[PDB]
């Protein structure tokens, strides 16, 4: 459509395109503010590179390819709850 751009583009659309809403969307953090805190601590990573600013709109591919940074305490306690630690990958 063209009405989709003339009407549907919102501050809410770009705000859910923002990163911590996507983290809270993929349930990286339980809350969006804890997602922001994880962003500040750099316990995440966005494809090739990690990130530190919440003020980030993520391209769809990097949304598919965003996760925690390696050897992070948060992913380690993920693998500890799942009881699947692999210290070979310093997981």
């Amino acid at each position: 459509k063209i009405s989709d751009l003339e009407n549907k583009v919102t501050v809410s659309a770009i705000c859910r395109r923002r990163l911590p809403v996507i983290m809270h969307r993929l349930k990286m953090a339980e809350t969006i503010q804890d997602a922001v805190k994880f962003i500040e601590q750099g316990h995440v990573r966005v494809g090739p590179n990690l990130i530190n600013d919440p003020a980030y709109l993520v391209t769809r591919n990097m949304e598919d390819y965003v996760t925690w940074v390696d050897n992070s305490k948060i992913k380690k306690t993920l693998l500890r709850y799942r009881n699947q630690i692999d210290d070979f990958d310093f997981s």
């Binding site: 993929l26 349930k27 990286m28 339980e30 925690w68 948060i74 306690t77 993920l78």
Partner: peptide, 28 residues
């Protein structure tokens, strides 16, 4: 339950990831 099993999404971090016979019962 099967759908939620398919989309478990194994990267979620929740903060709750950090937590005679009668004679034996009386003991415990």
């Amino acid at each position: 339950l099967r759908e939620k099993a398919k989309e478990r999404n194994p990267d979620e971090y929740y903060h709750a990831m950090h937590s005679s016979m009668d004679q034996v019962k009386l003991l415990k």
